[PDB]
Amino acid sequence: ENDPRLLDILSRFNREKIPERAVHARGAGAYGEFEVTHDVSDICDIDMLLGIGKKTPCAVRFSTTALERGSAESVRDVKGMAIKLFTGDGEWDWVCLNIPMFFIRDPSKFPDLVHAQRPDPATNLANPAAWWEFVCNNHESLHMAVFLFTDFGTMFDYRSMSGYVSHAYKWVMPDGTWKYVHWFLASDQGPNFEQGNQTREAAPNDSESATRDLYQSLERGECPSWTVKVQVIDPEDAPRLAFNILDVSKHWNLGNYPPDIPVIPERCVGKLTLKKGPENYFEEIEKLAFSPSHLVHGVEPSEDPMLQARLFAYPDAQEHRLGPQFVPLQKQSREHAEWVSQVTSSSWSQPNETDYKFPRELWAALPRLRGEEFQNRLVVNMAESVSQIPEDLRQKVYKTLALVAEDLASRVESLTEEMV
Amino acid sequence: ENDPRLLDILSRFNREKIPERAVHARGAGAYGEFEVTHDVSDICDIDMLLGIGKKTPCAVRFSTTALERGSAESVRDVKGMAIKLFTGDGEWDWVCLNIPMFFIRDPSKFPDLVHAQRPDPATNLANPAAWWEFVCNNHESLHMAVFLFTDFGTMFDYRSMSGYVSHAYKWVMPDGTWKYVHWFLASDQGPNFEQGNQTREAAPNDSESATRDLYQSLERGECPSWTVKVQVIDPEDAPRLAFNILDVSKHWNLGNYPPDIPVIPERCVGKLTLKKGPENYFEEIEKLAFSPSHLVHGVEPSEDPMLQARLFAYPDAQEHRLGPQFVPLQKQSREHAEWVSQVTSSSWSQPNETDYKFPRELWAALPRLRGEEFQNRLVVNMAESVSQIPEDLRQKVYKTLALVAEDLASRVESLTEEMV
Ligand code: HEM
Ligand code: HEM
Ligand SMILES: C=C(C)/C=C/c1cccc2[nH]cc(C[C@H](NC)C(=O)O)c12
Ligand SMILES: C=C(C)/C=C/c1cccc2[nH]cc(C[C@H](NC)C(=O)O)c12
Numbered sequence: 144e145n146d147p148r149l150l151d152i153l154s155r156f157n158r159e160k161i162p163e164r165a166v167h168a169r170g171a172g173a174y175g176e177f178e179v180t181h182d183v184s185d186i187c188d189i190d191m192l193l194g195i196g197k198k199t200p201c202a203v204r205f206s207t208t209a210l211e212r213g214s215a216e217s218v219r220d221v222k223g224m225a226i227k228l229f230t231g232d233g234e235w236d237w238v239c240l241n242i243p244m245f246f247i248r249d250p251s252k253f254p255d256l257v258h259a260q261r262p263d264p265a266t267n268l269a270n271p272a273a274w275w276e277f278v279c280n281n282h283e284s285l286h287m288a289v290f291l292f293t294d295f296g297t298m299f300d301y302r303s304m305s306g307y308v309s310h311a312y313k314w315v316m317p318d319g320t321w322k323y324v325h326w327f328l329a330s331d332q333g334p335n336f337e338q339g340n341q342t343r344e345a346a347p348n349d350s351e352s353a354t355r356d357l358y359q360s361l362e363r364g365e366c367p368s369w370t371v372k373v374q375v376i377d378p379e380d381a382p383r384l385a386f387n388i389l390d391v392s393k394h395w396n397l398g399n400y401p402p403d404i405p406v407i408p409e410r411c412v413g414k415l416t417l418k419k420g421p422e423n424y425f426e427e428i429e430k431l432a433f434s435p436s437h438l439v440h441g442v443e444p445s446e447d448p449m450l451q452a453r454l455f456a457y458p459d460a461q462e463h464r465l466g467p468q469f470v471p472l473q474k475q476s477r478e479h480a481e482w483v484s485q486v487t488s489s490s491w492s493q494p495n496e497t498d499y500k501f502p503r504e505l506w507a508a509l510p511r512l513r514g515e516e517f518q519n520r521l522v523v524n525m526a527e528s529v530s531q532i533p534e535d536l537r538q539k540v541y542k543t544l545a546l547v548a549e550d551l552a553s554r555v556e557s558l559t560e561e562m563v
Numbered sequence: 564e565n566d567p568r569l570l571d572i573l574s575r576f577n578r579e580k581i582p583e584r585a586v587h588a589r590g591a592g593a594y595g596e597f598e599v600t601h602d603v604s605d606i607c608d609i610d611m612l613l614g615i616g617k618k619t620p621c622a623v624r625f626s627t628t629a630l631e632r633g634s635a636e637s638v639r640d641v642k643g644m645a646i647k648l649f650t651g652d653g654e655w656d657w658v659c660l661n662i663p664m665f666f667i668r669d670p671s672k673f674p675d676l677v678h679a680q681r682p683d684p685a686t687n688l689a690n691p692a693a694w695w696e697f698v699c700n701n702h703e704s705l706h707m708a709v710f711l712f713t714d715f716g717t718m719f720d721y722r723s724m725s726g727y728v729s730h731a732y733k734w735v736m737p738d739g740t741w742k743y744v745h746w747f748l749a750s751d752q753g754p755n756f757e758q759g760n761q762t763r764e765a766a767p768n769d770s771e772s773a774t775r776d777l778y779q780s781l782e783r784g785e786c787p788s789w790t791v792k793v794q795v796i797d798p799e800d801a802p803r804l805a806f807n808i809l810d811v812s813k814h815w816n817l818g819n820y821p822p823d824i825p826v827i828p829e830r831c832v833g834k835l836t837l838k839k840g841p842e843n844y845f846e847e848i849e850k851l852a853f854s855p856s857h858l859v860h861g862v863e864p865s866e867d868p869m870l871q872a873r874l875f876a877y878p879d880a881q882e883h884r885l886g887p888q889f890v891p892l893q894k895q896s897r898e899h900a901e902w903v904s905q906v907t908s909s910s911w912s913q914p915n916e917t918d919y920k921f922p923r924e925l926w927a928a929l930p931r932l933r934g935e936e937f938q939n940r941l942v943v944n945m946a947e948s949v950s951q952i953p954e955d956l957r958q959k960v961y962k963t964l965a966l967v968a969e970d971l972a973s974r975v976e977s978l979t980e981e982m983v
Pocket of ligand 4: 662663725754755756819
């Protein structure tokens with residue numbers, strides 16, 4: 144010690160690591176561009192989206208959700224896709240999940256949900272009991288639960304996944320009229336709901352299989368691409384829908400389920416192609432800052448309470464993580480006002496019939512569009528998870544599943560009791 | 564948003580994570596006690612070591628070395644064991660590795676070595692090329708290299724590993740006389756150099772196999788134990804030894820290799836038994852602070868330059884990681900003075916004959932004490948690692964290995980060329 148040169152070298156080495164992200168800590172990154180392929184000048188006034196053939200540079204970060212920096216990328220989890228676009232009007236961020244539904248509806252429950260998916264606070268091991276307790280206490284997560292224990296829970300790498308903003312936004316015209324919008328990116332080298340499964344199994348002991356897949360595909364000359372599509376709803380038609388489009392835990396039906404809810408059609412916008420990887424991972428990918436509050440002229444947030452909370456949360460989290468510490472809108476009708484005020488009532492945090500209707504119809508649709516083996520594998524995965532928790536929690540889970548569907552609960556209980 | 568309660572909840576959640584340790588980021592912890600079993604009053608004046616049957620509470624943290632928080636614990640790596648003992652004279656820290664040798668003896672090279680074992684700075688993937696360049700540029704790591712690619716590289720969990728302080732310390736008597744000492748903990752449920760291999764193969768996709776093993780063993784009622792032993796050298800006998808005991812990259816021979824270096828015998832001191840696990844992992848294990856500078860009356864550091872650098876580095880690193888940011892000694896002879904001044908010369912950072920003698924004798928001892936299959940597996944592991952690097956670096960590695968033994972280099976070269 145003692146030597147000033149050695150002290151400087153060691154002190155510089157000591158201050159090299161920073162806190163990881165609270166969620167989505169493990170991930171990879173790439174650079175590409177977006178190109179406009181269709182005309183949307185009748186619903187949009189965003190400069191980035193006007194003019195067929197226009198190109199915009201973009202940077203993308205893929206991630207998992209629940210575990211730490213060095214965790215395996217082939218786990219049962221939801222995946223994230225964050226896109227930063229450098230337009231002439233500034234930076235536009237699309238922070239998407241690989242599925243258009245979310246776990247919860249009330250933002251004040253967000254930390255608890257996160258704690259339900261982190262390792263055990265005493266042993267630092269995996270703990271399904273907290274997750275199943277949260278599910279039994281918050282029925283609006285049931286829909287997502289049914290999704291997570293199918294094959295779709297473990298099906299996607301960074302190239303075969305899709306991305307959905309999952310919120311309703313507002314697109315505004317210069318005359319003041321606006322529409323509710325939801326856009327998403329469909330993978331050009333991945334499956335969909337109707338057809339397609341995993342085609343490249345990860346190595347038995349590989350924790351970075353998806354990162355390796357993306358890096359090797361980029362080095363081989365292949366360029367992954369996504370097709371961007373949007374769904375449009377008139378503000379006066381929203382209060383009359385069979386579901387609430389301000390509820391982030393529900394999706395907008397594209398033609399799969401539930402059958403009694405009419406389809407909201409989508410239209411194409413453009414295409415996103417990834418070209419190259421980074422030169423310095425820590426400086427370019429690890430320190431990337433994304434926020435849903437990064438918006439350009441012509442796009443506004445809606446009255447979604449989760450989106451409103453996200454507008455504040457991301458800059459504050461980045462202040463902790465990267466800090467020095469180391470056109471007027473036209474008015475709608477009174478009925479629209481009541482429908483909007485629905486989201487600030489005390490019943491917003493209580494379950495309704497739709498919270499059970501959506502998972503029931505997904506469970507019914509699984510054998511019609513995929514087959515009996517898909518449903519059987521869902522039952523097997525759920526039983527494998529449930530057979531690790533104490534008996535009273537098991538009975539509570541059985542009751543909740545019966546609230547979803549009787550045959551699903553009976554099958555899960557019968558298969559789970561044989562595994563304990 | 565806009566609710567002060569929600570803002571407080573989200574802001575509190577946003578600040579929970581802190582930066583991980585620069586090294587040894589992944590690990591687990593436990594609590595136990597140390598008990599004295601033998602009399603060492605003739606060489607020691609430390610309060611906690613005097614009196615047969617005396618008990619001292621202690622807290623232990625086990626860890627890996629190179630990878631991040633959520634990485635697998637069954638990787639080819641060296642393991643760490645940190646023991647904090649709560650004595651009547653203060654806190655005494657034993658910060659040990661699972662092997663008594665280290666990679667280097669010049670502290671100014673420490674960060675580079677660490678960077679040679681971290682993931683690729685551009686792709687965040689495993690990069691064998693950086694490791695072999697360091698070995699070809701720093702021959703004093705060759706010894707450790709030979710250790711790392713044997714079975715001992717992947718043999719130990721947290722219960723079957725041993726611990727070595729690896730440095731020379733000074734134990735001082737009240738009259739001013741002192742001795743060079745090195746103490747270590749031998750596992751009571753693990754293998755040794757001559758006998759024993761792995762008996763608990765980890766699961767194919769388990770990243771927390773060692774933590775689970777320790778937690779389950781503690782829950783079953785089994786208490787792991789270690790036997791503490793010490794080796795003693797008189798200061799006037801150190802300058803005449805065939806090796807430098809102030810070189811942390813060498814070990815003190817206990818009877819295995821090299822045959823021409825006489826044995827330095829050990830004597831028993833006491834026993835360490837682990838009893839219980841933590842209640843809050845983050846508050847008790849993750850925020851634990853260890854330092855070799857935590858010393859009690861009667862024990863002093865030696866003139867080891869690596870130890871002198873570690874005396875400063877640990878409090879500074881803890882200041883970054885956990886900070887608000889989120890008896891006179893007897894004089895020796897002139898010959899001892901020259902021998903000590905040897906460690907401050909310019910030739911300290913250059914290889915000597917011992918740097919080649921130690922790994923050569925380990926390679927020769929492997930078949931005599933473990934069989935031919937051990938040596939063959941070492942060759943196979945080395946070839947598997949070397950076959951992923953460019954050809955010029957491969958030739959450099961072959962030339963570097965030729966300086967240890969010709970047969971080892973030829974066998975590795977043949978296997979590696981067949982593998983590519
Ligand atoms: C109340 C709801 C939510 C809150 C409070 C929340 C909070 C956060 C926070 C604190 C981060 C870390 C940001 C950073 O440290 O820089 C993050 C990252 C992220 N979130 Fe959310 N989140 C919520 C829901 C969602 C939703 C609904 C989506 C997608 C539709 C989403 C997708 C993502 C993604 C992809 C990232 C990773 C961004 C990156 O890679 O840099 N989260 N979120
Ligand atoms: C020049 C040489 C070395 C330097 C500069 C160095 C530096 C460090 C640093 C910065 C930490 C992180 C401490 C913290 O963030 O709280 C650490 C941890 C650790 N080091 Fe060293 N190290 C060196 C060599 C060694 C040696 C020779 C050993 C063992 C004989 C060792 C064993 C450990 C262990 C076990 C830990 C983990 C402590 C814990 O779990 O809290 N290191 N070292
Ligand atoms: C895209 C895949 C592979 C799975 C989607 C998926 C799976 C399970 C439930 C789902 N609910 C909604 C979706 C996405 C929806 N499927 C018409 C879409 O492509 O807009 C979905
Ligand atoms: C203790 C195990 C299982 C292996 C030790 C080991 C292995 C390879 C090279 C080694 N060099 C020195 C040791 C440790 C040394 N073996 C007499 C001891 O027990 O003090 C060692």
